[PDB]
Design a protein around this ligand. Structure first.
Ligand SMILES: CCCCCCCCCCCCCCCCCC(=O)OC[C@H](COP(=O)([O-])OCC(O)COP(=O)([O-])OC[C@@H](COC(=O)CCCCCCCCCCCCCCCCC)OC(=O)CCCCCCCCCCCCCCCCC)OC(=O)CCCCCCCCCCCCCCCCC
Ligand SMILES: CCCCCCCCCCCCCCCCCC(=O)O[C@@H](COC(=O)CCCCCCCCCCCCCCC)COP(=O)(O)OCC[N+](C)(C)C
Ligand SMILES: CCCCCCCCCCCCCCCCCC(=O)O[C@@H](COC(=O)CCCCCCCCCCCCCCC)COP(=O)(O)OCC[N+](C)(C)C
Ligand SMILES: CCCCCCCCCCCCCCCCCC(=O)O[C@@H](COC(=O)CCCCCCCCCCCCCCC)COP(=O)(O)OCC[N+](C)(C)C
Ligand SMILES: CCCCCCCCCCCCCCCCCC(=O)O[C@@H](COC(=O)CCCCCCCCCCCCCCC)COP(=O)(O)OCC[N+](C)(C)C
Ligand SMILES: CCCCCCCCCCCCCCCCCCCC(=O)O[C@H](COC(=O)CCCCCCCCCCCCCC)COP(=O)(O)OCCN
Lengths: 293, 104, 64, 71, 60, 111, 121, 375, 71, 99, 145, 85
C-alpha cells in the first residue's frame, strides 16, 4: 500500500463532520439563530458527539429483508467516496475525470438497494423517483464533461481529462458549462431545489431512514462527502488549481442556494433536466467541440 | 516455463466457460425471461472481450470497433426485449401463474 | 470502405478486376517493403566505423 | 500547438538515436543467446544455430518494454 | 457562526493537500508525477528506470 | 521496438469510402469543391432537375390533399427530390472533373 | 505488481539485480508504473475494509422504465461522442460528428413531440 | 468526399422526412400517403444495380400496404439494413446489418398488435429475440476465434455460412419463423419472409459463401413438405412452404446460380402477396397456384429456374427428393384450394386496400410469356 | 482493418500485404490455385502472427537442456 | 553495451543534435527507411550513438553547470520545454548551437 | 501476474453464481460484479477507455433497466430449491467439456490510444458510427412507443 | 410578481387549456406576448438566467449579517408580566 491513503482518508472524515456542523450553523445565520453552544464551548466538538453517541444506540435486528443487500448499501457508499477522493488526489490516470463520472454512476446503486430492502409497493416508486433524478442529471453532467475535455489539452498537445492538467489553466470559456455543472451537482446531491425526498419521505416513502446506527451514519457522511467532491470538481475543472478555501466556499454556496430555494415537484425538475438543461448542454457542447481546437 | 502461455490458456478456459454459462445457463437451470436476457448479455460481453483480446494480440483496431458495435447492439436488443417482457407481464390473465417462466 | 463497398462497371474498360482489399490497403494504409543490405557494403561501412573508433575520432558507445 | 510542435520535433530527433541503441543492445543480447544455444545443442545432430524463422522480413519481438499492463 | 466550522473544513483540507503533495514529491522526486503521459513519455520513463538499474549493477 | 512519435494535431486521416480507380480521362480538377462541381453541371441535367421538381410538386400536392395538407407536402417533396437529383448530378460532374468519367465537353468549356 | 518476464521487456539489461528491484519496487508513476489502475483497486479494498469495521463494531456490543431506457441510449450516444473530443479534429471528422449529433437530436425531437419528455405519464 | 456523399444523401433524406412527419402529425392524415411517396423517392438514391433495384421495388410495394408514418419509417430502416447487408465486406458489416434488421423486425412486430393480441404476439417476439441472441452470440464468438487465428476478418468462412443459414431459415433454423410469423400481422409476416432473403442471397453469391454439404437443403425440403402436409392451420402451411423452397434455393445458390435465385425471390414475392393479403378468394387461388409452381402463372417460371439449375449440377438424390417433396407440398396447396371453394360457405372481411394485389395477380397471370426466355 | 491501435499499421499488416501482392501477381484462373501458388508467403504471415516454429525451437532447446542437466 | 544519456539530458541536447550531428542522423534515417533487419543498420546505429555520446561529453566540458541546470529543470517540470525557458536561454548562450 | 490470474479465474465463478442462484435480484448483483471483473481483465490487456465503456454502459445504465424491470415484475420464485448434487456436477461437466483443449494464444499487452481510436471512428470507419447511431434511434423509437 | 406565464402552472388540465387555447391573453393577470424584439430578449434572459431567484437570494443573505434574536434560556429568561398565571 501507500501512506498517502491515510493522508487522504483522515482529512475527509474530519472535513465531513465539520461540513455537517457548517450546514446548521449557516441555517442559524439565515434564521437569526446561533450555532449549538451547550455541546461544548467552542463547538468544534459538536458532530463528534453525534457520531460517538450513534455508536452507543442499541442495535435493531433486521426485519423482513435480505441481510446481505442491506449491509451492502453502506459499504457501497463508503467504497465509492474513498475511491473518488483517492483518484482525485493520488492518481495520474489520463481519463481520471471520466473514472469519477463512472464512480458517480455507481451511487445510483446505494439508494436502489436501500429501496429494494423496503419491499413496499410505494417504496418501489419512491426509490425509482430518486434514481430517476440521479440518472437524468448524470446525463447532463456527461455532456458538460464532454465540453470540458475540449479545452483540456496537455503541454504535449494530447487531449485528455487528467485532473492536474485541467486544473493547470483557468478557462473563462468553460464557465457557461460550469453553471450547468453547479445546478446538476445540486441535483446529484439531492439538494432542496431537487430535494423531492423530504416531502415524500416524511411519510415513509423509502430512503436511508430504514438504516439506524452505523449504517445510517455512513450514508449521511457519504452524502456530504459527495457534495464536497462536487465542490472539488467545480474548482478543478472551471476555477483553476485546487484550493481548499474555494472548495469550502462552493459548499457554503450550496447551503446558501438551498436556503434561498424551495423544492421542485417530480415532473418539474425532471422536465428541467431533459427539456431545459440537456438542450443547453448540447448547445454548449456544440459550442465547445465547435468553438474549435 | 512461460507465464504468458499459461495465462493465455487460463483466459481461453475462462472466457469459454463464461460464454457457455451465458448461452445455456438459464435454460439448463430453468429460469425466467429476465435471467435469460441477462445471461445473453453475459455471453455477448464474453465475445466482445475475446475481440478486444484479439485486438491486443494483433495490434489491430478491428476488434475494438466490433466490440463497441456489440455493446451498442446488445444494449438496444436488451431494451427492446425488456419492453416486450413488461408488456407481456401486463397482459397476463389472472389464471396464468408463472407467465415469465415459459421454461418450466 | 473498411466495412462496406459497392461495385460499378467501367465504360472505358481500362480499369480491371483486382483484389479490392489489396487496393484499399494500398490507398489508405500503404505497403512498407524493405530490402536486405548486401554483405560487402555492410562490411565496408562497419570497418569504417571501427577504424574511426580506433583512431579516437568517434565517441564512446556508452556515455558513462 | 506551438509547444506541441516543439515537443514533436524534439521527439522525432531523439527517436532515431533511441531506436539505434535498442538495436545495438538487441544484437549483443542475441549473440549471447546464440552462444548459449550452440553450447546446449553441441550434442544434437542436424541443428543449426541462428536459423531464420522468417525467410525475408525481420520478426520483431512481440513483447516490448514500453507496453506494461495497467494492472 | 458560519466561519469557524468553515475554517476547520478549509484548514483540514489544506493540511491534507500539503501532506499529499510533499509526500509524493519526496517519493516520486518531481512535482510532475501526476501529469499526463503518452506512450513515448511512458516508454522513456521505463527505459530510464532500466538503464539506472543497469548502471547500479555495473558500478558494483 | 520504440514507439513512433505522434503529432496530435497532424494525425493521418482519410474519408471512409474510396473509389479504387486510376483516372482514365484527363483530370481537370483533382479535388473539386461542391461549387466547382455545380458550375460544371450540364444544361440537360439542370432541365432534368427542373422537370423532377415540377413532377414531384404535382405528386406531393396530390398525395397531401388526401391528408388535407397539399401545399406543404408539395413543397417538401419538391425540395427533397430536387436536392437528391442535384447531388446526383454534382457527383457525376465531380467524377468527370476528376477524370473518372467522360469529360470532353468539360475540358473544352473550361480549358 | 506486474513483473517483466523476458529480456526484451527488461531492456536487454542483464543480471538478477534488476529482477529483484522490479519485484520489490514501489508503485511510482514517474517510474515503471504509469497510468496504473492498481492503486485504485487498493483504494477500493481500503474503503471496503473501513466500511466492514464500522458495520461489525455495533453488532458485537412506466415513466421510471422509460427514463431508464432513454438514459441508456443517450448514454451510449455520449459514449460515442467521447472519442471525438479526445482528438484534434479535422473538418471532415467534424461533419461526421455533426451528422451523428443530428441523428441524436432527431431522436430527442421525437421524444419532445410525443410528450415522453413531459413526465405526466 | 464525393463518394461519401452518395451514402450521406440517404441519411439526410430519411432524417428530414422523419422530422417533417413528426411536425405534421395530425388526425386529418393518419394514412400519410405523402410521406410514403417521399420515402419511395428517397430510396431511389440507393439503387446502383439490378439487385438493388429489386430491393427498391419490393421495399416500395411493401411500404404501400403499411399504415402510418411510424411503420413506414421502420420499413425504411429495414431497407437501409438490407442495402448494407448487400454491401458488407467482412464480419462486422454482416453483423451490424443483420441485427439492425432484427431490431426493425422486433419493433414492427410490436407496433402492429392490438391489446387483445399482445399475449401471443409479445411471446412470439420474445422467443424470436432469444433465438436470435443465440445465433448472434455463436456467430460473434466464432468470429473472434477466426479473427485471432487468421489476423483478418474474411466473410468467406463456415461461421458466416451458418449465420446466414439461420437468417435464411433452413433445416434446423426455421422454427423462429414458425413461432413469430404465426402471431404477427399478415403484412409483417409477408414483408419479412421475402425481403430479407434477397440481401442474404446477394451476400452468399458475391462473397463466395458456399459449402459442399447438401444435407441442410435436403432436410429443409423434406421437413418443410412433410410438416406442411401435416399442419392443420393455414398460416403454418404457408410458413412451411417457404422452408422447403428456401432449402431448395439454398442448394441451387451454393453451386453459383445467382441469376435464377434472384428471379425466384421476386416471383415468390409476387406469388405470396395475394395469399397473405387475402381479400378475394380468386386472387388467393391464383396466388396459391403460383406458389405451387403451376404452369399458367409466373410461379411456374420461378420454380422452373431452380429445377432447371438442379438438373445441371446432376445430383440425383436432390432431384428424386425434389419430385417427391414437391408432390407432398402440392397436397397442402390443394388443401388450401379445397378450404376456399369446396368445404363450406366462406365469408371474409371486406378489406378494400388492394394497393398492389391486383397488379400482382395481373403480373402473375401475364408475366409468364415475356419471361419465358429465362427457362 | 490493420490500423494499429496506436499509429501506423498492425503488427503483421505488411506480411499479409506481401501475400496479397503475390496473389495479385499470379495469373491462375481461380483463387484457390492462386493461393496454392502463394502459400509460402502465407506461411510467413502465420509465422509472424503466432511464432509457432520459434516456439517449437525453444521447446526443443529447453528439452535438450533439461536432458543434459539431469545426466 | 550501447547507451545514450538519460531522457532529460537528451531533451536538453535535442536542438543541438540536429544542428551539430546532421550527418549521422540523416544516414540512420535513410538506412532505417531502406532496411528492416537491425544487423543491416548496425554501422549507422553505432555512428549515431557514438556521436550523441560525444556531444554529451563536449557539452559537459564547455558548459557543465548550464547543461546540468537545464536538465534538472526539465526533469523537475515533467519534460516540458515551456516552463524551462530561462535555463534554456542560458544554456544555449553558454554552448552555442550550430557551432 | 497473480492478480491477473485471480481475475481471469474469478470470472467463471462469478458467471456460475448468476445461473445457480434462484433469485432474479441476486443474479443481477452477481452480474454487476462480473462486469467489474471484466473491466479489471481489460485493464490487464492495456485498455482503459474500453474498460470504462463496459462499466458505463452495462453497470451504469443496463443494470438499472434490468432492476427496474425486476421490481415491476416481482414474483415469488422462492418455490423450492432443486440444486441437487447431481445437477450441479452435470452442469460443471458440461462446462468442462465445452471449455477444454481449445487453441490458446500467449497473453498480449497492447497499449491503446483514444486519439487514434477517435480519428478512425470519425474519419475512416465513419460508416460504422452512423449505423450504430441509426440502431440507437431504432431502439429509441421502438421502445418508447 | 402576481403576473403569471402561460407555461408555468401547477395543474395538468390548466396547462393543457393554456397550451392549446388563447383565453389567457384575454385575462388581465397573465403576461402578454412581448410584441417587440427587446421585450423577447428581456423575458428570455429573465427566465433563462434565474433572475427572480437571485433577488430572493440577496434578501435571504441579509439574514446572515442582521442581529440575531435569541435568548440563552438558562442565563436569560423571557419577560414575564405581573398578571402571569
Ligand atoms: C432504360 C434503360 C434500362 C436498360 C438497362 C438498365 C441500365 C441503365 C439504368 C437506367 C435506369 C433504368 C432502370 C432500369 C433498371 C434499373 C437498374 C439500375 O438503375 O441500375 C443499374 C445501372 C448499372 O447496373 P447494370 O446495368 O445492372 O450492370 C452492372 C453489372 O452488370 C452488375 O449488375 P447485374 O446484376 O445486372 O449483372 C448482370 C446480370 C444480368 O442480369 C440481367 O440480365 C437483368 C435482367 C433484367 C431484369 C429486369 C427486372 C429487374 C427489376 C427491377 C425493376 C427496375 C426498377 C427501377 C429502379 C431504378 C429507377 C430509376 O447477371 C447476373 O447473373 C446477375 C443476376 C441479376 C439478377 C437476375 C435477374 C432477375 C431479375 C428479376 C426478374 C424476375 C421476374 C420479375 C417479374 C418480371 C415479369 C415481367 O446503374 C445505373 O445506371 C445508375 C443507377 C441510378 C438509378 C437512380 C439514380 C438516378 C436518380 C438519383 C436520385 C434519386 C432521387 C430523386 C428521384 C427522382 C425521381 C422522382
Ligand atoms: C393542365 C395543366 C395545368 C393544370 C393546373 C394545375 C397547376 C397547379 C400547380 C400544380 C398543383 C398540383 C396539380 C394538381 C394535381 C392534384 C391536385 C389535387 O389533388 O386535386 C384536388 C383534389 O384531388 C383530386 O380531385 C384529384 C385530381 C387528380 C388530378 C386531376 C387533374 C389533372 C391535371 C392536373 C395536373 C396537370 C399537370 C399540372 C401542371 C404540371 C386537391 O384538393 P385541395 O387540396 O382541396 O385543393 C383544391 C383547392 N380548393 C378546394 C380550395 C379549390
Ligand atoms: C439543438 C440542441 C437540442 C435541441 C433539442 C432538440 C429539439 C427539441 C424538440 C423541440 C420541440 C419544440 C416543441 C415541440 C412542438 C413541435 O416542434 O411541433 C409543432 C411545431 O413544429 C415546429 O417545427 C416548431 C419548431 C420546434 C423545433 C423542431 C424542429 C426540429 C428540430 C429537430 C431537428 C433534428 C435534426 C434533423 C436534421 C407542431 O407543428 P404545427 O405548428 O402544429 O404544424 C401543424 C399546424 N398546421 C396546421 C399549420 C399544419
Ligand atoms: C418491366 C416491368 C415488369 C417488372 C416488374 C417490376 C417493376 C414494377 C414496375 C411497375 C410497378 C407498378 C406497381 C403498381 C403498384 C400499384 C399502385 C398502388 O399500390 O397504389 C396504391 C398506393 O397506396 C398508397 O399507400 C399511396 C402512398 C404512395 C403513393 C404512391 C407514391 C409514389 C412515389 C413516387 C414513385 C415514383 C418512382 C420514383 C422514381 C423511379 C393505392 O392503392 P390503395 O388506395 O392503398 O388501395 C386500393 C383499394 N382498391 C384497389 C381495392 C380500390
Ligand atoms: C446509409 C449510410 C450510413 C453510413 C454513411 C457513411 C457515409 C457518410 C460519411 C460522411 C458523413 C458526413 C461527413 C461529411 C460528408 C462530406 C464531406 C464534407 O463535406 O466535408 C468536407 C469539408 O470541407 C468542406 O467542404 C467545408 C464545407 C462543408 C459544408 C457542409 C458539407 C457537409 C455537411 C455534412 C452534413 C451534416 C449536417 C448536419 C446533418 C443534418 C471534406 O473535408 P476536406 O475537404 O478534406 O477539408 C477541407 C480542406 N480542403 C477543402 C482545403 C481540402
Ligand atoms: C439569452 C442569450 C442569447 C444567447 C443564447 C445562450 C443560451 C444560454 C446559454 C448560457 C448557458 C448558461 C445557462 C445557465 C443554465 C440555465 C439552463 C436553461 C435555463 C432555463 O431553462 O431555466 C430553468 C432552468 O434553470 C432552473 O431553474 C434549474 C433549477 C435551478 C436551481 C438551482 C439554482 C442554482 C443557482 C444558479 C446557478 C448559479 C451558479 C453559481 C452560484 C427552466 O425553468 P423554466 O420552466 O422557466 O424554463 C422553461 C421555459 N419553457
Amino acid at each position: 500500500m501507500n501512506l498517502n491513503i491515510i493522508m487522504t482518508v483522515l482529512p475527509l472524515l474530519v472535513s465531513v463532520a465539520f461540513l455537517t456542523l457548517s450546514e446548521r450553523a449557516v441555517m442559524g445565520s439565515l434564521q437569526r439563530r446561533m450555532g449549538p453552544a451547550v455541546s461544548g464551548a467552542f463547538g468544534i466538538l459538536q458532530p463528534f458527539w453525534d457520531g460517538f453517541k450513534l455508536a452507543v444506540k442499541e442495535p435493531i435486528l433486521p426485519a423482513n429483508a435480505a441481510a446481505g443487500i442491506f449491509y451492502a448499501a453502506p459499504l457501497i457508499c463508503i467504497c465509492i467516496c474513498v475511491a473518488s477522493w483517492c483518484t482525485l488526489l493520488l492518481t495520474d490516470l489520463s481519463i481520471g475525470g471520466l473514472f469519477l463520472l463512472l464512480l458517480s454512476s455507481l451511487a445510483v446503486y446505494g439508494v436502489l438497494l436501500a429501496g429494494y430492502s423496503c419491499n413496499s409497493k410505494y417504496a418501489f416508486l419512491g426509490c425509482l423517483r430518486s434514481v430517476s433524478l440521479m440518472i437524468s442529471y448524470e446525463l447532463v453532467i456527461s455532456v458538460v464533461i464532454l465540453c470540458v475535455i475540449l479545452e483540456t489539452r496537455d503541454g504535449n498537445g494530447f487531449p485528455c481529462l487528467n485532473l492536474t492538467e485541467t486544473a493547470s489553466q483557468t478557462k473563462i470559456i468553460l464557465i457557461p458549462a460550469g453553471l450547468l455543472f453547479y445546478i446538476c451537482s445540486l441535483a446529484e446531491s439531492k439538494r432542496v431545489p431537487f430535494d423531492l425526498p423530504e416531502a415524500e419521505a416524511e411519510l415513509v416513502a423509502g430512503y436511508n431512514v430504514e438504516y439506524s446506527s452505523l449504517g445510517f451514519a455512513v450514508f449521511f457522511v457519504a452524502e456530504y462527502g459527495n457534495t464536497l467532491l462536487m465542490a472539488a470538481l467545480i474548482n478543478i475543472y472551471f476555477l483553476g488549481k485546487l484550493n481548499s478555501a474555494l472548495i469550502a466556499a462552493i459548499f457554503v454556496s450550496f447551503i446558501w442556494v438551498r436556503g434561498t430555494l424551495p423544492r421542485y415537484r417530480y415532473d418539474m425538475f425532471m422536465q428541467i433536466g431533459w427539456k431545459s438543461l440537456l438542450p443547453v448542454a448540447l448547445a454548449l457542447y456544440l459550442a465547445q467541440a465547435s468553438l474549435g481546437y | 516455463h512461460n507465464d504468458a502461455e499459461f495465462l493465455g490458456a487460463v483466459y481461453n478456459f475462462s472466457i469459454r466457460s463464461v460464454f457457455i454459462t451465458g448461452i445455456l445457463g438459464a435454460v439448463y437451470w430453468r429460469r425466467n425471461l429476465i435471467t435469460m436476457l441477462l445471461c445473453s448479455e453475459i455471453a455477448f460481453i464474453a465475445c466482445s472481450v475475446n475481440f478486444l483480446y484479439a485486438s491486443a494480440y494483433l495490434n489491430d483496431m478491428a476488434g475494438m470497433l466490433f466490440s463497441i458495435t456489440i455493446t451498442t447492439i446488445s444494449a438496444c436488443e436488451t431494451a427492446l426485449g425488456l419492453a416486450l417482457c413488461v408488456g407481456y407481464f401486463q397482459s397476463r390473465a389472472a389464471n396464468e401463474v408463472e407467465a415469465l417462466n415459459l421454461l418450466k | 470502405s473498411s466495412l462496406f463497398g459497392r461495385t460499378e462497371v467501367d465504360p472505358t474498360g481500362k480499369n480491371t478486376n483486382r483484389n479490392h482489399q489489396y487496393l484499399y490497403n494500398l490507398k489508405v494504409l500503404g505497403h512498407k517493403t524493405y530490402t536486405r543490405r548486401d554483405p560487402n557494403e555492410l562490411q565496408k561501412a562497419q570497418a569504417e566505423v571501427d577504424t574511426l573508433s580506433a583512431a579516437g575520432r568517434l565517441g564512446p558507445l556508452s556515455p558513462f | 500547438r506551438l509547444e506541441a510542435e516543439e515537443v514533436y520535433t524534439a521527439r522525432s530527433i531523439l527517436h532515431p538515436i533511441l531506436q539505434a541503441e535498442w538495436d545495438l543492445r538487441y544484437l549483443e543480447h542475441q549473440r549471447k543467446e546464440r552462444e548459449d544455444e550452440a553450447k546446449i545443442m553441441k550434442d544434437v545432430p542436424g541443428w543449426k544455430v541462428g536459423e531464420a524463422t522468417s525467410r525475408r522480413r525481420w520478426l520483431p519481438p512481440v513483447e516490448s518494454f514500453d507496453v506494461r499492463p495497467l494492472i | 457562526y458560519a466561519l469557524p466550522s468553515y475554517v476547520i473544513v478549509s484548514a483540514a483540507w489544506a493540511a491534507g493537500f500539503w501532506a499529499i503533495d510533499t509526500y509524493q514529491i519526496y517519493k516520486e522526486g518531481k512535482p510532475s508525477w501526476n501529469q499526463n503521459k503518452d506512450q513515448f513519455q511512458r516508454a522513456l520513463y521505463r527505459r530510464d528506470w532500466y538503464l539506472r538499474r543497469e548502471q547500479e549493477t555495473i558500478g558494483m | 521496438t520504440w514507439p513512433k512519435p505522434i503529432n496530435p494535431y497532424d494525425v493521418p486521416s482519410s474519408p471512409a469510402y474510396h473509389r479504387l480507380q486510376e483516372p482514365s480521362y484527363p483530370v481537370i480538377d483533382k479535388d473539386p469543391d461542391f461549387w466547382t462541381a455545380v458550375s460544371n453541371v450540364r444544361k440537360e441535367e439542370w432541365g432534368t432537375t427542373a422537370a423532377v421538381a415540377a413532377g414531384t410538386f404535382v405528386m406531393g400536392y396530390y398525395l397531401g390533399a388526401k391528408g388535407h395538407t397539399g401545399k406543404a407536402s408539395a413543397y417538401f417533396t419538391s425540395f427533397l427530390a430536387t436536392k437528391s437529383i442535384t447531388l446526383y448530378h454534382a457527383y457525376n460532374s465531380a467524377d468527370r472533373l476528376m477524370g473518372f468519367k467522360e469529360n470532353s465537353r468539360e475540358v473544352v468549356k473550361n480549358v | 505488481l506486474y513483473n517483466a518476464m523476458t529480456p526484451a521487456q527488461r531492456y536487454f539489461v542483464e543480471g538478477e539485480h534488476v529482477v529483484q528491484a522490479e519485484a520489490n519496487r514501489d508503485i511510482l508513476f514517474t517510474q515503471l508504473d504509469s497510468n496504473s489502475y492498481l492503486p485504485v483497486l487498493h483504494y477500493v479494498l481500503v474503503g471496503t475494509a473501513l466500511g466492514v469495521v464500522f458495520l461489525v463494531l455495533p453488532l458485537l456490543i412506466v415513466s421510471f422504465y422509460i427514463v431508464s431506457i432513454m438514459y441508456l441510449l443517450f448514454d451510449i450516444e455520449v459514449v460515442y461522442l467521447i472519442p471525438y473530443v479526445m482528438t484534434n479534429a479535422t473538418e471532415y471528422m467534424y461533419w461526421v460528428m455533426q451528422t451523428f449529433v443530428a441523428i441524436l437530436v432527431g431522436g430527442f425531437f421525437y421524444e419532445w413531440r410525443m410528450g415522453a419528455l413531459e413526465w405526466r405519464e | 468526399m464525393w463518394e461519401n456523399l452518395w451514402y450521406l444523401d440517404i441519411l439526410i433524406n430519411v432524417l428530414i422526412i422523419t422530422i417533417f412527419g413528426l411536425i405534421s402529425c395530425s388526425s386529418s392524415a393518419t394514412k400519410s400517403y405523402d410521406l410514403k411517396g417521399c420515402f419511395i423517392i428517397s430510396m431511389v438514391g440507393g439503387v446502383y444495380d439490378i439487385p438493388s433495384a429489386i430491393l427498391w421495388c419490393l421495399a416500395s410495394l411493401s411500404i404501400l400496404n403499411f399504415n402510418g408514418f411510424f411503420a413506414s419509417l421502420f420499413l425504411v430502416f429495414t431497407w437501409i439494413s438490407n442495402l448494407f447487408a448487400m454491401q458488407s465486406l467482412n464480419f462486422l458489416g454482416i453483423y451490424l446489418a443483420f441485427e439492425m434488421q432484427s431490431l426493425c423486425l422486433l419493433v414492427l412486430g410490436k407496433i402492429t398488435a392490438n391489446e387483445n393480441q399482445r399475449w401471443f404476439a409479445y411471446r412470439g417476439l420474445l422467443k424470436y429475440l432469444v433465438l436470435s441472441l443465440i445465433a448472434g452470440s455463436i456467430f460473434i464468438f466464432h468470429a473472434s476465434s477466426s479473427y485471432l487465428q487468421s489476423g483478418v476478418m474474411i466473410s468467406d468462412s463456415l461461421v458466416t455460412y451458418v449465420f446466414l443459414l439461420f437468417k435464411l431459415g433452413v433445416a434446423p433454423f426455421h422454427m423462429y419463423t414458425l413461432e413469430l410469423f404465426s402471431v404477427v400481422s399478415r403484412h409483417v409476416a409477408f414483408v419479412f419472409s421475402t425481403l430479407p432473403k434477397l440481401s442474404v442471397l446477394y451476400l452468399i453469391s458475391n462473397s463466395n459463401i458456399g459449402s459442399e454439404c447438401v444435407w441442410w437443403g435436403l432436410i429443409s425440403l423434406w421437413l418443410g413438405s412433410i410438416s406442411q402436409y401435416q399442419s392443420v392451420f393455414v398460416r403454418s402451411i404457408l410458413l412451411y412452404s417457404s422452408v422447403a423452397e428456401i432449402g431448395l434455393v439454398l442448394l441451387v445458390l451454393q453451386e453459383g446460380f445467382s441469376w435464377e435465385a434472384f428471379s425466384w425471390v421476386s416471383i415468390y414475392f409476387l406469388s405470396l402477396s395475394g395469399v397473405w393479403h387475402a381479400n378475394s378468394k380468386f386472387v388467393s387461388a391464383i396466388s396459391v397456384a403460383s406458389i405451387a409452381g403451376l404452369p399458367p402463372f409466373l410461379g411456374f417460371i420461378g420454380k422452373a429456374q431452380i429445377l432447371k439449375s438442379l438438373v445441371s449440377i446432376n445430383l440425383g438424390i436432390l432431384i428424386f427428393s425434389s419430385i417427391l417433396a414437391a408432390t407432398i407440398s402440392f397436397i397442402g396447396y390443394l388443401r388450401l384450394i379445397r378450404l376456399m371453394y369446396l368445404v363450406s360457405p366462406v365469408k371474409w372481411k371486406n378489406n378494400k386496400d388492394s394497393s398492389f394485389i391486383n397488379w400482382s395477380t395481373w403480373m402473375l397471370t401475364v408475366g409468364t410469356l415475356p419471361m419465358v426466355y429465362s427457362v | 482493418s490493420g490500423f494499429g491501435l496506436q499509429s501506423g499499421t498492425a503488427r503483421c499488416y505488411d506480411w499479409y500485404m506481401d501475400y496479397l501482392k503475390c496473389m495479385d501477381e499470379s495469373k491462375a484462373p481461380m483463387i484457390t490455385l492462386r493461393k496454392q501458388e502463394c502459400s509460402e508467403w502465407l506461411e510467413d504471415y502465420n509465422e509472424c502472427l503466432h511464432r509457432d516454429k520459434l516456439k517449437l525451437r525453444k521447446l526443443l532447446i529447453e528439452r535438450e537442456k533439461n536432458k543434459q542437466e539431469a545426466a | 553495451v550501447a547507451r545514450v544519456p538519460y531522457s532529460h539530458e537528451l531533451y536538453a541536447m535535442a536542438k543541438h543534435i540536429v544542428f551539430r550531428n546532421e550527418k549521422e542522423h540523416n544516414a540512420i534515417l535513410e538506412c532505417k527507411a531502406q532496411h528492416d533487419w537491425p544487423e543491416d543498420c548496425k554501422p549507422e546505429s553505432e555512428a549515431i550513438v557514438r556521436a550523441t555520446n560525444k556531444l554529451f561529453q563536449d557539452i559537459m566540458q564547455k558548459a557543465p553547470e548550464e547543461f546540468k541546470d537545464y536538465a534538472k529543470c526539465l526533469d523537475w517540470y515533467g519534460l516540458k520545454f515551456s516552463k524551462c525557458r530561462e535555463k534554456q536561454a542560458a544554456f544555449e548562450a553558454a554552448f552555442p548551437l550550430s557551432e | 501476474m497473480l492478480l491477473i490470474y485471480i481475475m481471469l479465474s474469478n470470472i467463471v465463478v462469478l458467471a456460475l453464481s448468476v445461473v445457480l442462484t434462484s433469485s432474479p435480484f441476486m443474479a443481477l448483483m452477481y452480474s454487476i460484479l462480473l462486469y467489474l471483473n471484466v473491466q479489471t481483465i481489460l485493464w490487464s490487456l492495456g485498455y482503459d477507455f474500453m474498460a470504462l465503456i463496459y462499466a458505463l454502459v452495462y453497470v451504469g445504465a443496463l443494470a438499472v433497466l434490468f432492476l427496474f424491470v425486476v421490481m415491476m415484475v416481482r414474483i415469488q420464485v422462492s418455490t423450492l430449491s432443486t440444486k441437487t448434487i447431481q445437477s450441479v456436477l452435470s452442469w460443471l461437466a458440461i462446462i468442462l467439456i465445452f471449455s477444454y483443449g481449445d487453441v490458446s494464444f500467449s497473453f498480449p499487452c497492447g497499449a491503446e490510444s483514444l486519439l487514434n481510436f477517435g480519428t478512425q471512428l470519425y474519419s475512416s470507419c465513419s460508416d460504422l458510427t452512423l449505423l450504430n447511431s441509426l440502431a440507437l434511434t431504432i431502439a429509441l423509437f421502438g421502445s418508447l412507443v | 410578481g402576481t403576473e403569471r406565464r402561460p407555461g408555468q402552472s401547477g395543474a395538468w388540465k390548466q396547462v393543457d387549456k393554456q397550451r392549446y387555447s388563447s383565453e389567457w391573453e384575454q385575462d388581465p393577470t397573465f403576461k402578454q406576448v412581448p410584441k417587440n424584439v427587446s421585450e423577447v430578449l428581456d423575458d428570455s434572459v429573465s427566465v433563462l438566467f434565474l433572475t427572480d431567484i437571485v433577488r430572493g437570494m440577496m434578501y435571504s443573505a441579509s439574514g446572515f449579517f442582521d442581529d440575531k434574536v435569541t435568548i440563552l434560556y438558562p442565563f436569560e429568561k423571557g419577560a414575564v408580566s405581573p398578571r402571569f398565571r
